[PDB]
């Protein structure tokens, strides 16, 4: 139970690791670009904004 609960806890940590990597690899062009705006659909998917 100790080794299982530790590896499973590390694996839900690695799954949350998509916010640390996948979110940035999708979203950073929309943070870098001058005056542009992200499409509304993607804004909800990445939890990034109330609007723009």
């Amino acid at each position: 139970v100790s080794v299982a609960s530790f590896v499973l806890l590390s694996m839900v940590g690695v799954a949350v690791g998509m916010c640390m990597c996948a979110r940035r690899r999708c979203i950073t062009p929309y943070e870098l670009t001058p005056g542009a705006t992200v499409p509304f659909l993607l804004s909800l998917i990445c939890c990034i904004r109330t609007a723009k």
């Binding site: 062009p29 929309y30 943070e31 870098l32 001058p34 005056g35 542009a36």
Partner: protein
């Protein structure tokens, strides 16, 4: 015509940040910040594919931003070391114009608005092509000639 819209970074010859649209933006491969009091406080994004650092313009500077466009017709454009030709889909200047530490500089449309930022250059014959970033159809991308040097 005016060319004053940069701010420098570090007490060294190491390039500049541009005040463009809604954001300050800067080359990421260079360091030492505080040649302006806003670089001292701004929280910066960065990304390794494109070599930008970006931050939203502060409440006191909002009015002073340079205008910009994604448009790039063929022909002639301006930058701080003079005329620059965009042809064959690439920017070019005479070799010996531009150098290491002349980086983060804008390229201007003759209608007085930014279309790219300079990051470096190549030496594949003495009429140097530029490494640059630009916002084609409202997304940033990087252009990089083969064997080009980061400035």
């Amino acid at each position: 015509n005016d060319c004053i819209f940069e701010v420098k970074h570090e007490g060294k010859v190491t390039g500049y940040a541009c005040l463009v649209g809604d954001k300050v933006m800067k080359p990421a491969h260079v360091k030492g910040t505080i040649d302006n009091a806003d670089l001292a406080k701004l929280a910066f994004k960065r990304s390794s594919k494109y070599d930008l650092e970006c931050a939203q313009i502060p409440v006191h500077m909002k009015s002073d931003a340079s205008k910009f466009t994604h448009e790039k017709p063929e022909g002639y454009y301006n930058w701080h070391h003079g005329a620059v030709q965009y042809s064959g889909g690439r920017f070019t200047i005479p070799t010996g114009a531009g150098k290491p530490g002349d980086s983060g500089r804008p390229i201007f449309d003759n209608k007085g608005r930014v279309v790219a930022i300079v990051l470096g250059g190549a030496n594949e014959g003495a009429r140097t092509a530029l490494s640059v970033v630009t916002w084609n159809k409202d997304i940033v991308t990087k252009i990089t000639p083969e064997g080009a040097e980061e400035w």
